[PDB]
């Protein structure tokens, strides 16, 4: 994807004006710097390869992290899957209105020892289980439950010390594209919830320890990294200026346009 | 010349003596649904003369200390002719629009409007924990208007009407990426857009999803000397194009 | 029993890698595509759309729509200065928050020309001439019209066509330039001066306004993607 080069020019005196246009027509002028001045013949070998939608978006970014404690009943984490709880990924996915991508999902699971009181503590390697419940399935309510069989739900099992686990998710949606924005209600009588939260029904993500509480409590932490592949993007959008406020909606407190300088002639 | 147009749709005609060239969509003209893209199994109803005509919305007065206006687009035509009587009886619906904003002044007035057509515009509530109701988001063929101050957090459910953030949280100057056209009273006199159907589903319900929003924001305000006519109105005429509907049910 | 030998780099998690991965839902069928208008294939189609740049920052106009209007009136002397700002599209707070300057804050290097479309938002009888000058660095800011007429300039005459495009060239020692503030690769200044006055007839308001746009030419390039410094977060959104 090589960019265009400037062609040579000569001093002119003619009735053709490339500089003057009419910006009222909603059409940006296509002038080249060989039309307003004299130029030479340079050839550009510059490439526009690192600004396509593929290379701009295919990079891993954290979206949530949850902690859970071993020595506890109902010590297990859960997360309703949505990508609107960080600020550095929510700003990239709200540059376009409709997206369509296949994920590549990676977890980085760590551990930390809690201040126990038993003497000569020694714990072996730990195993974690990450179950994905689709919208409508059975949910667990404690650590040793019947719902952790994964009879049809996908799940991974990971011992500590190895490489981090990684799956790949295809395009799981009802319509033809993921819609990052939605201006409309859920009920047909136009009440209830309003916004983007009526479109998000993607499931839940449950995590737990497989080992039992031996002698010392162990608190873990799991960070979740999304990575879109084969991305197509439609209908671009001006980026967000104000700070983000909530997860469910597009609320804000008003902010000035830019920062201020001291004059109009100052540099 | 390249300054006069004449648009004919149905049984109505919009002529003009000086206006700029038309801004058509993101490049594509509005057309009917294909066969390899459809998802409904029952045959659509395409009247094509009973809906595709120019409906004239209400006129708003451009003052000197005015802020802006917005019309939510498949909501403003809910009581207009046989387009508002096909929206109530049918479940789905698919339309493309042809917006035409017109505001005239003499050679001694000055000002500048920005006529943009923003798709899927969510508005932010005043108190940050709630969402705005229906009556504060859009009125039946009546313009809701911005302000030049900030709506406080004391109000429960009202739309934030700060014009310099355009209600959505973007900068107001960055709205020129959407299809837009300026009305400059020095040269221009009216600005016309043609908008295709931009949505992620091939057909959509029309009473709970407003997929376009027409915004008018004055960047350089109106100003005149003492003696000229002080009442300058703005009238918007909006026509559907290539409409079809499925799923006939009761009145709703 | 093929003998392998695992090189360094094993069992690491690099956040910009290109590998294959086992699919989690096998034999899934996707929803077929649809011709949605306005497909963007490259981010240099968003940067080539013009956007209004807020020149008039005076500490009480940024919280208004008065930040976009550069005020122009009828003078009594000649050769005054309408505005002026240095041309750093990722660090200067004039060009910081436009449509061009926000895509440029994700990247670190840039090269190419920059168009600057002006528009005269005045009356129908008022005329005037403006001199849009651009001076490459090495000296200071130009102070007079006699000093700013030496650089690249274009003399705009208002009339029926009411918008003029000054296209700044690419005059630089390096192939690219830094987005951040670096004085080794300074890029120059952009000024604008009264050529003749603004002459109006009777019963016309003498104070006219001017809008200014900014976009990139057909040879813009960016490189070395980074993260933006404008967004911020302390707690999770919930």
């Amino acid at each position, epitope marked *: 994807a090589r960019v265009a080069d400037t062609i040579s020019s000569r001093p002119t005196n003619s009735e053709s004006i490339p500089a003057l246009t009419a910006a009222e027509t909603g059409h940006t002028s296509q002038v080249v710097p060989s039309d307003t001045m004299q130029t030479r013949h340079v050839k550009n070998y510059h490439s526009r390869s690192e600004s396509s939608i593929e290379n701009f978006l295919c990079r891993s970014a954290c979206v949530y992290y949850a*902690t859970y404690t071993n020595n506890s009943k109902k010590g297990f984490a859960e997360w309703v899957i949505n990508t609107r709880q960080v600020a550095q990924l929510r700003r990239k996915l709200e540059l376009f209105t409709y997206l369509r991508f296949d994920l590549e999902l990676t977890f980085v699971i760590t551990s930390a020892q*809690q*201040p126990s009181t038993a003497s000569s503590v020694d714990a072996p390697v730990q195993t974690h289980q990450i179950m994905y419940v689709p919208p409508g399935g059975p949910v667990p309510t404690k650590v040793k439950d019947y719902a952790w069989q994964t009879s049809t739900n996908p799940s991974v099992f990971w011992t500590e010390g190895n490489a981090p686990p990684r799956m790949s998710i295809p395009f799981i949606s009802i319509g033809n594209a993921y819609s990052c924005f939605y201006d409309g209600w859920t009920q047909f009588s136009r009440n209830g919830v309003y916004g983007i939260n009526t479109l998000n029904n993607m499931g839940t993500l449950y995590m737990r320890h497989v080992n039992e509480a031996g002698q010392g409590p162990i*608190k873990s932490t799991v960070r979740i990294y999304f990575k879109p592949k084969h991305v197509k993007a439609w209908v671009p959008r001006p980026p967000r200026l104000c*700070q*983000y*406020e*909530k997860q469910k909606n597009v609320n804000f*407190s*008003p*902010i*000035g346009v830019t*920062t*201020s300088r001291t004059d109009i002639i100052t540099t | 010349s390249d300054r006069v147009r004449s648009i004919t749709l149905g049984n109505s005609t919009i002529t003009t003596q000086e206006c700029a060239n038309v801004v058509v969509g993101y490049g594509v003209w509005p057309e009917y649904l294909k066969d390899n893209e459809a998802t409904a199994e029952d045959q659509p109803t395409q009247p094509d003369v009973a809906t595709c005509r120019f409906y004239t919305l209400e006129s708003v007065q451009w003052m000197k200390n005015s802020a802006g206006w917005w019309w939510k687009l498949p909501d403003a035509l809910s009581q207009m002719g046989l387009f508002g009587q096909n929206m109530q009886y049918h479940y789905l619906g698919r339309t493309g629009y042809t917006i035409h904003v017109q505001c005239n002044a003499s050679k001694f007035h000055q000002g500048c409007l920005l006529v943009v057509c923003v798709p899927e515009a969510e508005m932010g509530c005043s*108190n*940050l*924990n709630n969402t705005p109701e229906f009556s504060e988001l859009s009125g039946g063929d009546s313009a809701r208007m911005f302000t030049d*101050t*900030q709506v*406080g*957090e*004391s109000n429960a459910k009202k739309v934030q009407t700060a014009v310099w953030n355009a209600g959505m949280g973007v900068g107001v100057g960055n709205l020129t990426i959407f299809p837009h056209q300026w009305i400059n009273l020095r040269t221009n006199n009216s600005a016309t857009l043609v908008m295709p159907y931009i949505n992620s589903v091939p057909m959509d319900n029309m009473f709970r999803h407003n997929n376009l929003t027409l915004m008018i924001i004055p960047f350089v305000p109106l100003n005149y000397s003492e003696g000229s006519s002080p009442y300058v109105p703005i009238t918007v005429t909006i026509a559907p194009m290539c409409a079809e509907y499925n799923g006939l049910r009761l009145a709703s | 029993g093929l003998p392998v030998m695992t090189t360094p780099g094993s069992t690491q998690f690099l956040t910009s890698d290109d590998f294959q991965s086992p699919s989690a839902m096998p034999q899934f069928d996707v929803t077929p595509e649809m011709q949605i208008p306005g497909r963007v294939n490259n981010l240099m189609e968003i940067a080539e759309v013009d956007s209004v740049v807020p020149v008039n920052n005076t*500490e009480d106009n*940024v*919280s208004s729509l008065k930040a976009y209007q550069i005020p122009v009136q009828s003078n009594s002397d000649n050769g005054k200065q309408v505005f002026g700002f240095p041309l750093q599209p990722g660090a200067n707070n004039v060009l910081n928050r436009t449509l061009l300057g926000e895509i440029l804050n994700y990247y670190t290097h840039w090269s190419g020309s920059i168009k600057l479309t002006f528009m005269f938002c005045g009356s129908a009888m008022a005329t005037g001439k403006f001199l849009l000058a651009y001076s490459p660095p090495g000296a200071g800011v130009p102070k007079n019209r006699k000093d700013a007429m030496l650089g690249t300039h274009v003399i705009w005459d208002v009339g029926l066509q009411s918008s003029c495009v000054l296209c700044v060239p690419w005059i630089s020692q390096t192939h690219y330039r830094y987005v951040v503030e670096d004085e080794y690769t300074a890029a120059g200044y952009v000024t604008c001066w009264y050529q003749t006055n603004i002459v109006v007839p009777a019963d016309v308001q003498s104070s006219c306004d001017i809008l200014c746009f900014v976009s990139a030419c057909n040879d813009f390039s960016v490189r070395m993607l980074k993260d933006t410094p404008f967004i*911020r*977060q*302390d*707690t*999770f*959104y*919930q």
Partner: antibody
Framework: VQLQQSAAELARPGASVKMSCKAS????????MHWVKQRPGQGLEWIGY????????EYNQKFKDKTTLTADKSSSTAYMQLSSLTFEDSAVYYC???????????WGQGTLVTVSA | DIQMTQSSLSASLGDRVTISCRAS??????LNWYQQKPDGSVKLLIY???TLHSGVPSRFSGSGSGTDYSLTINSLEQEDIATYFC?????????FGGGTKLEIRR
């Protein structure tokens, strides 16, 4: 990032007093800055906030007439001016920088304002 | 205005300490707990019903749903002798609860 208020001050009944909350370590013109009053025998009470980028203030319904919040973007301070001082307003005044939704993350250390004769 | 009802609690070192504050109507999980040191420095502890702030030791834990919520310190230390407020964020204006001071048993 830290917020540094002024010293403890003193005023007569009927005079006016002006506190300060010098924000440092971040960009002052982006976040709103609130003011919280704690009487020494009760719990915390809210007064009202100020948007430093647009100078739009909004007080509580009980302190609407007494307080007058103001700020300047240059020296990056936020002022609070009390008027018509009675013997009810002898308390400790904190300033807080309201992060994302409703969470007062960074607090000051608080000035003790007392009235006497 | 939502009335936030929470007085002077006592517990020994290294025990399970529980504080509870009750709102007027359902505030829908929007409760934050603060901690005021005896010198006068205030800091945010738990910014949801359960989610801990970054920089807080893992002794503190929260719970609750609907109207009644709680804060639980599962092992009391010497640094955690302070005053704890609860604050809602559901209805303007933001109203704080009364204090709750901790002290040693005997």
């Amino acid at each position: 990032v830290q917020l540094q208020q002024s010293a403890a001050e003193l005023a007569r009944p009927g005079a006016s007093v002006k506190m300060s909350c010098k924000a440092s370590g971040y960009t002052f013109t982006t976040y709103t800055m609130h003011w919280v009053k704690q009487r020494p025998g009760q719990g915390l009470e809210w007064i009202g906030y100020i948007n430093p980028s647009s100078r739009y203030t909004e007080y509580n319904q009980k302190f609407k007439d007494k307080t007058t919040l103001t700020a300047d973007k240059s020296s990056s301070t936020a002022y609070m001016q009390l008027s018509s001082l009675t013997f009810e307003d002898s308390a400790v005044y904190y300033c807080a920088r309201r992060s994302e939704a409703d969470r007062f993350v960074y607090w000051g250390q608080g000035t003790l304002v007392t009235v006497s004769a | 205005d939502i009335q936030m009802t929470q007085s002077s609690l006592s517990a020994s070192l290294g025990d399970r300490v529980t504080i509870s504050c009750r709102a007027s109507q359902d505030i829908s999980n929007y409760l934050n707990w603060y901690q005021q040191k005896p010198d006068g420095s205030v800091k945010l502890l738990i910014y949801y019903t359960s989610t801990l702030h970054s920089g807080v030791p893992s002794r503190f834990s929260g719970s609750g749903s609907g109207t009644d919520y709680s804060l639980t310190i599962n092992s009391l230390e010497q640094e955690d002798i302070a005053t704890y407020f609860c604050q809602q964020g559901n209805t303007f204006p933001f109203t704080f609860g009364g204090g709750t001071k901790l002290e040693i048993r005997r």
